[PDB]
Enzyme design. Structure first.
Site, PDB file in Angstrom:
ATOM      1  N   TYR A 185     -26.079   7.517  22.535  1.00 32.99           N
ATOM      2  CA  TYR A 185     -26.701   6.505  23.914  1.00 32.99           C
ATOM      3  C   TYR A 185     -25.397   5.389  24.383  1.00 32.99           C
ATOM      4  CZ  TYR A 185     -31.282   7.229  23.112  1.00 32.99           C
ATOM      5  OH  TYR A 185     -32.442   7.217  22.720  1.00 32.99           O
ATOM      6  N   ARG A 239     -16.473  -1.640  21.105  1.00 40.27           N
ATOM      7  CA  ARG A 239     -15.901  -0.250  21.815  1.00 40.27           C
ATOM      8  C   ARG A 239     -15.649   1.095  20.766  1.00 40.27           C
ATOM      9  NH1 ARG A 239     -11.826  -3.913  22.145  1.00 40.27           N
ATOM     10  NH2 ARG A 239     -10.405  -3.330  20.437  1.00 40.27           N
ATOM     11  N   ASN A 240     -15.617   0.725  19.285  1.00 39.54           N
ATOM     12  CA  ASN A 240     -15.346   2.222  18.731  1.00 39.54           C
ATOM     13  C   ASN A 240     -16.829   2.294  17.561  1.00 39.54           C
ATOM     14  OD1 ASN A 240     -13.050   2.573  19.537  1.00 39.54           O
ATOM     15  ND2 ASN A 240     -11.840   1.278  18.250  1.00 39.54           N
ATOM     16  N   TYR A 267       1.065  -1.158   0.301  1.00 42.68           N
ATOM     17  CA  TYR A 267       0.049   0.332   0.107  1.00 42.68           C
ATOM     18  C   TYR A 267       0.784   1.395   0.211  1.00 42.68           C
ATOM     19  CZ  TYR A 267      -4.040  -3.002   0.896  1.00 42.68           C
ATOM     20  OH  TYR A 267      -5.284  -3.355   0.953  1.00 42.68           O
ATOM     21  N   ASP A 286      -9.073  -0.224  14.587  1.00 43.31           N
ATOM     22  CA  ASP A 286      -9.705  -0.567  15.419  1.00 43.31           C
ATOM     23  C   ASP A 286     -10.297  -1.103  15.175  1.00 43.31           C
ATOM     24  OD1 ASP A 286      -9.297  -1.357  18.039  1.00 43.31           O
ATOM     25  OD2 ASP A 286      -9.133   0.691  18.788  1.00 43.31           O
ATOM     26  N   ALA A 337     -11.282  10.086  27.823  1.00 44.56           N
ATOM     27  CA  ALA A 337      -9.755   9.910  27.802  1.00 44.56           C
ATOM     28  C   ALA A 337      -8.920   9.478  28.152  1.00 44.56           C
ATOM     29  CB  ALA A 337      -9.982  11.914  29.067  1.00 44.56           C
ATOM     30  N   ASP A 396     -13.622   6.391  16.079  1.00 40.34           N
ATOM     31  CA  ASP A 396     -12.895   6.059  16.588  1.00 40.34           C
ATOM     32  C   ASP A 396     -11.787   7.107  18.168  1.00 40.34           C
ATOM     33  OD1 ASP A 396      -9.723   4.352  15.484  1.00 40.34           O
ATOM     34  OD2 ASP A 396     -10.221   5.133  17.461  1.00 40.34           O
ATOM     35  N   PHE A 434      -3.440  11.580  26.498  1.00 42.25           N
ATOM     36  CA  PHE A 434      -3.078  13.154  25.987  1.00 42.25           C
ATOM     37  C   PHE A 434      -4.601  13.559  25.428  1.00 42.25           C
ATOM     38  CE2 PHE A 434       0.546   9.773  25.085  1.00 42.25           C
ATOM     39  CZ  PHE A 434       1.454  10.594  25.947  1.00 42.25           C
TER      40      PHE A 434
HETATM   41  C1  LIG Z   1     -25.906  10.260  31.162  1.00 44.47           C
HETATM   42  C2  LIG Z   1     -25.871   8.450  30.675  1.00 44.47           C
HETATM   43  N1  LIG Z   1     -24.735   8.256  29.392  1.00 44.47           N
HETATM   44  C3  LIG Z   1     -23.690   7.942  29.100  1.00 44.47           C
HETATM   45  C4  LIG Z   1     -22.777   7.529  28.250  1.00 44.47           C
HETATM   46  N2  LIG Z   1     -22.647   8.473  27.523  1.00 44.47           N
HETATM   47  C5  LIG Z   1     -21.436   8.525  26.159  1.00 44.47           C
HETATM   48  C6  LIG Z   1     -21.853   8.986  24.975  1.00 44.47           C
HETATM   49  C7  LIG Z   1     -21.397   9.238  23.792  1.00 44.47           C
HETATM   50  N3  LIG Z   1     -21.178   9.993  22.749  1.00 44.47           N
HETATM   51  C8  LIG Z   1     -19.982  10.086  22.084  1.00 44.47           C
HETATM   52  N4  LIG Z   1     -20.386  10.846  20.825  1.00 44.47           N
HETATM   53  C9  LIG Z   1     -19.459  11.955  19.814  1.00 44.47           C
HETATM   54  C10 LIG Z   1     -18.059  10.402  20.797  1.00 44.47           C
HETATM   55  C11 LIG Z   1     -16.559  10.999  20.214  1.00 44.47           C
HETATM   56  C12 LIG Z   1     -16.601  11.274  18.666  1.00 44.47           C
HETATM   57  C13 LIG Z   1     -15.767  11.534  17.966  1.00 44.47           C
HETATM   58  N5  LIG Z   1     -14.390  10.609  18.142  1.00 44.47           N
HETATM   59  C14 LIG Z   1     -14.240   9.500  19.383  1.00 44.47           C
HETATM   60  C15 LIG Z   1     -15.826   9.532  20.182  1.00 44.47           C
HETATM   61  S1  LIG Z   1     -18.656   9.902  22.168  1.00 44.47           S
HETATM   62  N6  LIG Z   1     -20.064   8.772  24.632  1.00 44.47           N
HETATM   63  C16 LIG Z   1     -19.903   7.799  25.604  1.00 44.47           C
HETATM   64  C17 LIG Z   1     -18.131   7.677  26.106  1.00 44.47           C
HETATM   65  N7  LIG Z   1     -20.979   7.879  26.265  1.00 44.47           N
HETATM   66  C18 LIG Z   1     -23.775   9.138  27.165  1.00 44.47           C
HETATM   67  C19 LIG Z   1     -25.099   9.103  28.219  1.00 44.47           C
END
Ligand SMILES: CCN1CCN(c2cc(Nc3ncc(-c4ccncc4)s3)nc(C)n2)CC1
Ligand SMILES: CCN1CCN(c2cc(Nc3ncc(-c4ccncc4)s3)nc(C)n2)CC1
Lengths: 309, 309
Positions: free
Chosen positions: A122, A174-175, A15, A170, A44, A188, A47
């Site tokens: 969600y 989880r992603n 590639y 990846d 988080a 991601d 970094f």
């Molecule tokens: C109150 C109950 N909860 C629990 C959990 N909960 C969420 C919402 C959420 N929404 C995301 N939107 C975009 C994301 C992103 C954008 C760009 N790059 C990587 C990731 S992460 N992410 C997580 C980890 N938990 C929301 C309400």
């Protein structure tokens, strides 16, 4: 380390990646950072972090909108700052698709770089599945309809990525994020995941890698292809129909683990995967990458199962 | 007793109903009964039943399709046979809408009358809600999104009925069906419900009536209007956000019950109804029918809450 790679040429099984630092940034995305109001932190890493925020006047001049903002923590070094900008440039190169977390704007002046994307209300698909795991026929039928829909939507999102010559590297539950209308969106977390505290990422060489999700050619040759993303999608299907169980249950990633995967050992079907979804997993786990299906073909296969309803 | 009535004129607060026996039956609906294969019984009353079946070649000449077939039991008398035919004629008069159980065909020769409608694969909304009742923030938010969607879809289905000058007269969660994609469809089991064994249907005069769902003007004047359907929708909202609890809890339909409803007594809000959905219920329960909102207006109100997401 930019996670999503973009290929430009396939010169006979090798590639040519595009340097993301050479992709353009269009100032149409520029958004004033004083019109972001920052809320809770959504994820988080060492970094970086992703934060929920309200953006005033981002899409319509008279409307507020909930967004996610990716940013670096003060401990970040130059290579992490470049990577954030490269992720910004890849996202604007990709363009818009319903089944990915889309770019909505960016703040590249007047402060450190901020990358504004859609907010998924969600959270991550893995935690969604594990809650239903901890938690009659009509209810089970409806759950199966959701899981079929999630596999269809992730497959369309990946087909869109492959159509833009982009390799995810990846792919895993989880992603994948879930949002209004049970729409799933590939993303991601990258620098916003603390992979040092995630057992799914394993020490191999000089990196921490999600080995149980990786294709063999990626483990022994450190190569990432469109076909290895298909392999990961197969693993994703297995966690999907297993309600978020970790792949290869009761089997830690030893040197013993590496032996078995080159021996052609595969997982058995999840107890409640439909036969035709199991059939898709097995073909994703073909030792020959060129015998695996493309995401375009996986989309057609899953479309057919959904239509039979 | 035909349940869905069709009005033709409002001559100053008095309805002129159309005789359903005078509506046309278009033979475009005719389907050969030997291309139905009958399965399980989905509901049965004293005189009628609804049966699941496969229809071969109903829509596409090369395809089978799951349908529901309404038919009479041998114990049925002439008045029940007329009613089935009148329901067939009303359904073809209505035409097609996503949120009602639609007519797909009919067998009116070569045997007793069969009425072929869409099959809803998840059953009735009341039992769906009561299972979730017997059965954390992300999960609750997603349940609220579903309940908002169900109220929106039932309101559109009723707006479609009112637009065809049709009055339902028995709107309740038990008469709403759920199917693929969490689409809700208004129906009437009518002759396929055993109302003698349903406590929600109460002896009043010479009939068994769903009194806890009826508007006051319908209880004391036996009149059914577009505005009384709106009242029933308000009751439906209350069971919806109460997860299928029976309305007016711990209060049987006595003569004491009848007193209170003319005294302006209303139910309090369900514990988890959004304020703006409670506000809609209260306006549906206005003692003045002409102060209740139309279904067209309820659609707009709920659209606004959903858009705020
Ligand atoms: C109150 C109950 N909860 C629990 C959990 N909960 C969420 C919402 C959420 N929404 C995301 N939107 C975009 C994301 C992103 C954008 C760009 N790059 C990587 C990731 S992460 N992410 C997580 C980890 N938990 C929301 C309400
Ligand atoms: C195996 C688990 N279940 C349980 C229950 N379950 C259903 C499905 C169903 N579907 C209907 N489609 C159209 C109907 C209709 C048409 C015209 N008029 C009146 C009614 S009823 N109805 C009921 C009562 N239960 C389906 C699977």
């Amino acid at each position: 380390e930019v996670q999503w790679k973009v290929v430009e040429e396939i010169n006979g099984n090798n590639y040519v990646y595009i340097d993301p630092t050479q992709l353009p940034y269009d100032h149409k995305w520029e958004f004033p950072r004083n019109r972001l109001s920052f809320g809770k932190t959504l994820g988080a890493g060492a970094f970086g972090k992703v934060v929920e925020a309200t953006a005033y006047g981002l899409i319509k001049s008279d409307a507020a909108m909930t967004v996610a903002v990716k940013m670096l923590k003060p401990s970040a070094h130059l290579t992490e700052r470049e990577a954030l900008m490269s992720e910004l440039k890849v996202l604007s190169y990709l363009g818009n698709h319903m089944n990915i977390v889309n770019l909505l704007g960016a703040c590249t002046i007047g402060g450190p770089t901020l990358v504004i994307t859609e907010y998924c209300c969600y959270g991550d698909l893995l935690n969604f599945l594990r809650r239903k795991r901890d938690s009659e026929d009509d209810e089970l039928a409806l759950d199966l309809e959701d899981l079929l829909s999630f596999s269809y939507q992730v497959a369309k999102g990946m087909a869109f990525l492959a159509s833009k010559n982009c390799i995810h590297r990846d792919l895993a539950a989880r992603n994948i994020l879930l949002t209004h209308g049970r729409i799933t969106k590939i993303c991601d977390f990258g620098l916003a995941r603390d992979i040092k505290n995630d057992s799914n990422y394993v020490v191999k060489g000089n990196a921490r890698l999600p080995v149980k999700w990786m294709a063999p050619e990626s483990i022994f040759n450190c190569v990432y292809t469109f076909e290895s993303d298909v392999w990961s999608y197969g693993i994703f299907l297995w966690e999907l129909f297993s309600l978020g169980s970790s792949p290869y249950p009761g089997m830690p990633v030893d040197s013993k683990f590496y032996k078995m995967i080159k021996e052609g050992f595969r997982m058995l079907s999840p107890e409640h995967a439909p036969a035709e979804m199991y059939d898709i997993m097995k073909t994703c786990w073909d030792a020959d990458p060129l015998k695996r299906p493309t995401f375009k073909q996986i989309v057609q296969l899953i479309e057919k199962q959904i239509s039979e309803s």
